[PDB]
Amino acid sequence: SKFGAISSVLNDILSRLDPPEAEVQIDRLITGRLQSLQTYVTQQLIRAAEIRASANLAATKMSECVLGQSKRVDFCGKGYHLMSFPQSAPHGVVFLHVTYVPAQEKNFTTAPAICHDGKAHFPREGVFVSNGTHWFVTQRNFYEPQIITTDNTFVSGNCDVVIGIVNNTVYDPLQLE
Amino acid sequence: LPVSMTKTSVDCTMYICGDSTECSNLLLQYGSFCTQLKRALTGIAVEQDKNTQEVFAQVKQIYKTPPIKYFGGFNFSQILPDPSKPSKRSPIEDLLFNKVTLADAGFIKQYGDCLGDIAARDLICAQKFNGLTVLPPLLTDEMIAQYTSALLAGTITSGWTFGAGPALQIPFPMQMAYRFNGIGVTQNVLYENQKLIANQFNSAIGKIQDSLFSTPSALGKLQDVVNHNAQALNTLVKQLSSKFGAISSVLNDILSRLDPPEAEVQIDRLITGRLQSLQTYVTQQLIRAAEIRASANLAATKMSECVLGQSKRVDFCGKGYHLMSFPQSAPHGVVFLH
Amino acid sequence: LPVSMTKTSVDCTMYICGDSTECSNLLLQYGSFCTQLKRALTGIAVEQ
Amino acid sequence: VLHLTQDLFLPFFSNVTWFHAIDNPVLPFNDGVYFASTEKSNIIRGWIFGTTLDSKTQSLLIVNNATNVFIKVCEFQFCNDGVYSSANNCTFEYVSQPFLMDLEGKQGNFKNLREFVFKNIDGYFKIYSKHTPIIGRDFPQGFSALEPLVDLPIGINITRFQTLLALNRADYYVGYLQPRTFLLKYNENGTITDAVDCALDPLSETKCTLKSFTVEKGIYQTSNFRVQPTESIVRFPNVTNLCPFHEVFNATRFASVYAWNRTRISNCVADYSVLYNFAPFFAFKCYGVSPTKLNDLCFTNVYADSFVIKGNEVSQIAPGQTGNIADYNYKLPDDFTGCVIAW
Amino acid sequence: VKNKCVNFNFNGLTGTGVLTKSNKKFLPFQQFGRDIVDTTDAVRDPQTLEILDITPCSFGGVSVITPGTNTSNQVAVLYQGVNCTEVSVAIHADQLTPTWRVYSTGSNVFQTRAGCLIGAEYVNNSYECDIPIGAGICASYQTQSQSIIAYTMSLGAENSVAYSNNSIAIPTNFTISVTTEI
Amino acid sequence: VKNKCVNFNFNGLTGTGVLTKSNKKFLPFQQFGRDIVDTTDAVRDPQT
């Protein structure tokens, strides 16, 4: 770009104009070129800052999803996070998140607690689920029905505050033996 | 947290040379010192689009709330969208929209009333005079409310499951018991003090609306972003009133008053001044866009953590042992209810 | 981890035209170019 | 490379007038004209250029023959058909290799098509050409480049264009070039395999903005659209404030030259039509301004010195003059910025 | 000549745009009218003593939405931020600076909140976005036999949960999905 | 002189570079030539 001078090539300008009139045009060239360079360096600085932010995020993602398991949702891939393998890329990194996603689900029934004998029973882990006829306990992200024993539940209450409590019998392996 | 700002798409050719053929020819000597500016501004606009999409488009399926609203005594009408309002917005979002006044909405098509302004033209008509325009956002401020409603429906009827896989229904009482279980309190405690905790939640949801209403400016961050953009734009427009060391400030005056080869120096001075002003404006826009992008990434992580699950990290989702959050849409921002 | 940097309050007229009335007058012809700089420096101090 | 250049170029899918030959209208010349002609062997010899095509302005004649060409920038009188007559002022006779190249593969089916382009920017007549026996129906559809042949500095005035014929015992494809921005695709061997206009189609505008032939799916911001003002109004204050010019030129006792009345004209709008209609002038010479260029100028003060004088003394009255009036009665300063009026 | 873009040279001030009647209170001494940024807004008529505003003659930006050129050559034009009845009369009177004239069949008119789309038609269906237009509108290339259509965003497939007092959906099975993050 | 960085003044065009044989396809009307970004690259020998 001529930048408002005689020509955009100094080698031509000096071989065409003497110093005491060429210094003005060469100064115009200097100011234009250095303004363009200032624009370039500012844009490069901004791009480098953005890349640094992305690199810090990627470093945290490495040290979290690879060197351990992340409980954060939607951080190491969609769904529940299981593992992650890194892969090198040109001027970047690529992850392989392995995520646990549930599958076919069925309505059964639920009750906040079970009242066996005046006492409300609550599951130590999981919810109280009902086939429709027989109440059961299971895990949360997989259906594994189990018999309601004294081991699966902890008892604390008086069977008159829990709204929606449902009547059923609990079991124990100690009365039998 | 702000998520985005207004998208400006200035055109250097006319902003610097108002419909002047000779001025455009003179600017043509400055190389590709315009395509760079236009590319930067369109990149900023696309960046804003991706920020809002990253903040809000976290769930694919748009769930709807069940017709009956009895979540174990929890009162959600203040955050649930109101069908009576024609925009389908919650009462809280109503206050958020009312308490923010945008100088430039953008979606106005204001051409046609600048002539009919009757009074002195507004900032918008002034900007439309000297090569300034605003690109309206891709995601209309209405559909954003629909995304917010879908996210709110997912977190009150299906727990935190819908962000992992299929949305599995769960009543709010045992969802409450589980959010309690994730902190260190047994579910039985909730099942014993459900009425008390529901009254606490209702009182808090009542008090937050009054706190937002009576404050002078608690939405000061979004107001600050809007004011910063408007002030930068107004200064950028005002810069055309500086002679920059020439005879006059008006291109059509200098051209019609002086001969070409003498007015060339003055028009070159005007080019060097106005274009430097535009460069400074573009750089400030770049810095603001970088900061807003960082805030939008923080907001997206906050959404996916606090709203879409329980966050164990202290103080991240509000002060204290975090339980949940509800998202609420705002002009050029989001409002969280930890 | 750094937390803040030194706060700066550079001034347009005093930096550019040290006590020169003609120089300040010719700076006024440049419009409000530098009020932006003063506002930005106030901002950086505030964020520190 | 995909270089983009802005230079006078015939628009793509532009409108081209097609003539026949069995009388040779004078087609106007402005911003160049694209020329094409297909023939069996030859029916066309040359062209003539210039304005008014007579012995008053310089003209051009580029007739070819069997072995050479007769380019000349001369002032031919007329032919109306031994192509020039009445030599008065001819110059710059140019002779080189013949333009017309004709080749046949032992048959007349290989009718050569010839595309010629001419331009006159800052003089420097430019002639572009490419000869090839194309399909021969008419103007082809496949892209073809044009190689400049001669570039000669005529430095004259061209307004009208005409073509010459042959003797004997489907041509004239004429299109007008326009100033447009173009992009040309260059082969690795350097030949232009394709070119796209940048003022024809939205797709052309997009391809031009990114200087690329393949545009991926998406949106592209290309330019700005403007509703050009249909008319132009000029409105100024209602002030008339006619100058006392009327009373300085309707006077009945114009003072003598020895005592020249000097009237100070101030606080008025100097309209010169009241001056033009009041006196059938015989000497309205000006020195610092133009008689025509005065109604659009502002002045601080105006002096009207009026005196009746003889005939030769009118020519005497002028800056830097001498005589019994210019020395003893009224002397005009050499640096006079004004006008004199004699009737 | 009011309500028409026209070059004006009022008493020495020169500009471009539309002038019409106004209801200002120009004090008798007042001659010019401006605003916060001091842009000449209202001009008093020197030969009529009435008040007229000055308006940006036409301020928008042309954007072209196109599919891949290797797929099709059809294109559509976006006139950003303009009521496109204004361009429709502008196209008719042929005072538009753009020289490329894309066809107007009446069905290719689109009063979008983000400008006007020309060369495309409404489809009241809802498809996932392909090319973002703005104001919740997306264009895409589709078979009728092929053309360019414009349609509103579909935020996703419509789904309704089955929340009840005692209803739980518990997954009886699971799957492993391997995504990618770059 | 080929294969030696040397100050050239070909046809008044000044500069400093290494000249060498090139396999380009200059037209007889072509004189200077250039490269992608506007720098004189391949100047054909006016004599040979």
Ligand SMILES: *[C@@H]1O[C@H](CO)[C@@H](O[C@@H]2O[C@H](CO)[C@@H](O)[C@H](O)[C@@H]2O)[C@H](O)[C@H]1NC(C)=O
């Ligand atoms: C309740 O849950 C029971 C699981 O113990 C299911 O009972 C099964 O019934 C078969 C015969 O019907 C038995 O042979 C088997 O051992 C098991 O007990 C029962 O289907 C289920 N009820 C409903 C309505 O789902």
Ligand SMILES: *[C@@H]1O[C@H](CO)[C@@H](O[C@@H]2O[C@H](CO)[C@@H](O)[C@H](O)[C@@H]2O)[C@H](O)[C@H]1NC(C)=O
């Ligand atoms: C579960 O079974 C309890 C008895 O073991 C029921 O308590 C009864 O409640 C009735 C009133 O509803 C009393 O009249 C009676 O004396 C006894 O206390 C209890 O209601 C029952 N609950 C459900 C949900 O079935």
Ligand SMILES: *[C@@H]1O[C@H](CO)[C@@H](O[C@@H]2O[C@H](CO)[C@@H](O)[C@H](O)[C@@H]2O)[C@H](O)[C@H]1NC(C)=O
């Ligand atoms: C949930 O909370 C709402 C608060 O917005 C209650 O609405 C109230 O309705 C009364 C009139 O019935 C108004 O006077 C009051 O200002 C408020 O709008 C709503 O009733 C409540 N619902 C339940 C089931 O608690």
Ligand SMILES: *[C@@H]1O[C@H](CO)[C@@H](O[C@@H]2O[C@H](CO)[C@@H](O)[C@H](O)[C@@H]2O)[C@H](O)[C@H]1NC(C)=O
């Ligand atoms: C550029 O010019 C080269 C010199 O003729 C071409 O190379 C030739 O290609 C032909 C086949 O077309 C070979 O038979 C011959 O031996 C030589 O390699 C080259 O193709 C050409 N490139 C173009 C026109 O794109």
Ligand SMILES: *[C@@H]1O[C@H](CO)[C@@H](O[C@@H]2O[C@H](CO)[C@@H](O)[C@H](O)[C@@H]2O)[C@H](O)[C@H]1NC(C)=O
């Ligand atoms: C859980 O879902 C798996 C796939 O998502 C099932 O595996 C399938 O098993 C069938 C045969 O049963 C194969 O044909 C198929 O290729 C796939 O491996 C799996 O059976 C299922 N488990 C249950 C208990 O439903």
Ligand SMILES: *[C@@H]1O[C@H](CO)[C@@H](O)[C@H](O)[C@H]1NC(C)=O
């Ligand atoms: C639960 O029951 C509702 C009742 O209509 C049904 O729509 C839903 O699909 C059921 N959920 C299942 C089967 O997982």
Ligand SMILES: *[C@@H]1O[C@H](CO)[C@@H](O)[C@H](O)[C@H]1NC(C)=O
């Ligand atoms: C060429 O002329 C014909 C008939 O006069 C006209 O219809 C056509 O539009 C013209 N071409 C163009 C490109 O306008």
Ligand SMILES: *[C@@H]1O[C@H](CO)[C@@H](O)[C@H](O)[C@H]1NC(C)=O
């Ligand atoms: C040159 O041409 C003019 C007419 O244009 C003619 O009057 C003049 O005589 C010619 N020159 C000669 C023959 O001296």
Ligand SMILES: *[C@@H]1O[C@H](CO)[C@@H](O)[C@H](O)[C@H]1NC(C)=O
């Ligand atoms: C053609 O023009 C040239 C011009 O030098 C001339 O020598 C030659 O005699 C002319 N005629 C033929 C048939 O070559």
Ligand SMILES: *[C@@H]1O[C@H](CO)[C@@H](O)[C@H](O)[C@H]1NC(C)=O
């Ligand atoms: C004087 O004015 C009258 C009235 O307009 C006009 O008819 C007449 O020609 C004028 N005479 C001179 C000498 O200006």
Ligand SMILES: *[C@@H]1O[C@H](CO)[C@@H](O)[C@H](O)[C@H]1NC(C)=O
């Ligand atoms: C000049 O003109 C005025 C007009 O009123 C007249 O009074 C005066 O006597 C004139 N002077 C001479 C020298 O004639």
Ligand SMILES: *[C@@H]1O[C@H](CO)[C@@H](O)[C@H](O)[C@H]1NC(C)=O
């Ligand atoms: C302007 O001058 C004309 C000429 O006499 C007159 O008819 C008109 O009323 C004037 N208008 C104003 C506003 O002065």
Ligand SMILES: *[C@@H]1O[C@H](CO)[C@@H](O)[C@H](O)[C@H]1NC(C)=O
């Ligand atoms: C813009 O929209 C339509 C179409 O032109 C019309 O009502 C009028 O021109 C404008 N309306 C408003 C409210 O600006």
Ligand SMILES: *[C@@H]1O[C@H](CO)[C@@H](O)[C@H](O)[C@H]1NC(C)=O
């Ligand atoms: C179909 O599209 C038209 C506009 O072309 C719209 O008015 C109408 O409401 C649409 N119908 C449905 C069912 O969406």
Ligand SMILES: *[C@@H]1O[C@H](CO)[C@@H](O)[C@H](O)[C@H]1NC(C)=O
């Ligand atoms: C849940 O129970 C309450 C009262 O116990 C009742 O009002 C509501 O309709 C019930 N909802 C469902 C879905 O069963």
